[PDB]
Symmetry: C2
Subunit: 248 residues, 2 copies
């Protein structure tokens, strides 16, 4: 099992966090030993919210930088903090509340592909491999000792949509193991190699430059595929697949 | 090895396992227009799913499993496979027929042991030290058909219905991808073997401790009734009803 009377704060959003809470209940962690920091109910975060309400699990939606959020942590007094797709930077003072520390899920092999749109940028740049990294957190983004990584092959037929969902699914299959490592106080290993980073913004503002090769265009199209967001644009109009691009 | 291109997969399901199943199928490269979901009305446990369906524009029905609307929904979609993930109505033989590659259902017992519906509680109540889950091809009957995948889960002294139910889901989801690939490849699965047993829908002994049971049976029953937000096991002392504490406190 996990050490009894262990207190776990999950900071998270969506399925990953719903799945994490599920896993924790499965490892024996009591309800009063669990707490969730999240964001408001929306069309990705409804499962989490409906579970929090049904099972009466204490939670906050307060902003990560608010005194209300800090107090939610201090009143709970966690042993560990798990970040599952939490969308805001968690201040150092908050992370410091967790006496056994924390773990975040990042869908790249860090220090490669820090930032956001990792799954989109992996496809554009033509990577044959990506993966995910579970890592210990510090005050900074995507930094800290690696507890676990798994390599994910990128396919020629992958879109951002498919790679995003495979990222989640595969990452979940290693979560239990990761919580143990955190519980056992595994220090993990330092990040190393060639670090890269990519921004909030939508790659090339979602528009296809026609001076690119057919190979890069196809990749851009695939990386911009993410329903219900609009797909890539050509100018001459809307291009969700290479066939439709070949039709034009 | 990857799922066949243009595979068409209908998912009949409810709650997280179904949401996770769809996540699993999209990550395996099954395209959205080639996914369909049959589920029930939106309620607490099914929001995750309903919101996904709506956000990603995945076609779905909530029609009753025995309704003509449901049959036609399947017929029109024309699945290669059907995957049941905590679907709550018996799917008729004629619907399952539509899937050329057939179907799979997730059941949280080592079938044919613990057919029926409070598998987790009954496993605890009977003092099993070992249970598991079963992925199986469906036919017209409930809990019948060839096994594609069984995995063992051990039951602990500290397990409750709550803990075990959630470990059943978590652990079962980790074999899902593999099971979809078994169906992809036409694995026939293997006939069910061993002693069958069965348990009905109504809550074991109406949620009530019989004080004449031994300490060890009462221990088990209190654990099997622990499932928030539902009320725990009940003890009657001098014709006067009491809610039991958590086994933690019961054990002192
Ligand atoms: N301290 C910390 N480290 C991280 O790596 C991390 C968090 N917080 N919180 C969530 C998310 C990073 N989110 C953001 C949001 C806006 C600008 C930068 C990072 N994240 C990890 O994903
Ligand atoms: N054909 C079929 N076989 C099954 O084993 C199965 C289904 N359908 N559908 C969902 C669920 C069983 N649901 C019910 C509903 C009413 C009375 C009995 C079982 N199930 C499998 O779980
Ligand atoms: N096409 C498109 N995809 C997006 C957009 N925003 C996010 N995504 C994709 O959705 C993934 C996760 O979304 P998020 O960063 O959580 O917001 C990203 O990695 C992107 O590939 C958008 O505006 N357009
Ligand atoms: N204690 C208690 N547990 C329940 C009750 N209803 C369902 N459950 C539990 O939740 C599981 C079934 O969930 P389901 O009804 O399939 O949705 C069972 O294995 C039970 O242990 C109830 O009324 N009381």
């Amino acid at each position: 099992a996990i050490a009894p009377n262990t207190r776990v704060l999950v900071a998270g959003y969506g399925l990953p966090a719903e799945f994490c809470v599920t896993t924790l209940i499965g490892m024996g962690v009591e309800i009063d030993k669990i707490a969730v920091a999240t964001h408001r109910e929306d069309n990705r975060n409804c499962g989490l919210h409906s579970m929090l309400r049904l099972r009466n699990i204490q939670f906050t939606t307060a902003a990560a930088n608010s005194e209300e959020f800090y107090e939610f942590g201090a009143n709970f007094a966690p042993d560990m903090i798990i970040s599952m797709h939490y969308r805001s930077l968690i201040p150092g003072r908050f992370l410091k509340l967790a006496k056994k520390g924390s773990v975040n899920l990042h869908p790249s092999l860090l220090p490669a592909y820090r930032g956001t749109n990792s799954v989109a940028w992996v496809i554009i740049n033509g990577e044959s491999e990506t993966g995910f990294s579970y890592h210990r957190m510090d005050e900074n983004a995507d930094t800290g000792a690696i507890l676990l990584q798994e390599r994910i092959s990128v396919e020629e037929t992958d879109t951002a949509f498919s790679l995003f969902h495979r990222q989640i699914a595969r990452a979940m299959l290693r979560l239990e193991e990761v919580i143990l490592k955190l519980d056992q106080g595994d220090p993990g290993f330092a990040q190393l190699g060639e670090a890269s980073y990519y921004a909030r913004e939508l790659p090339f503002g979602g528009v296809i430059d026609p001076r690119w090769s057919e190979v890069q265009i196809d990749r851009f199209i695939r990386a911009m595929f993410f329903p219900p967001f609009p797909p890539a644009v050509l100018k001459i109009y809307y291009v969700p697949s290479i066939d439709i691009y070949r039709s034009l």
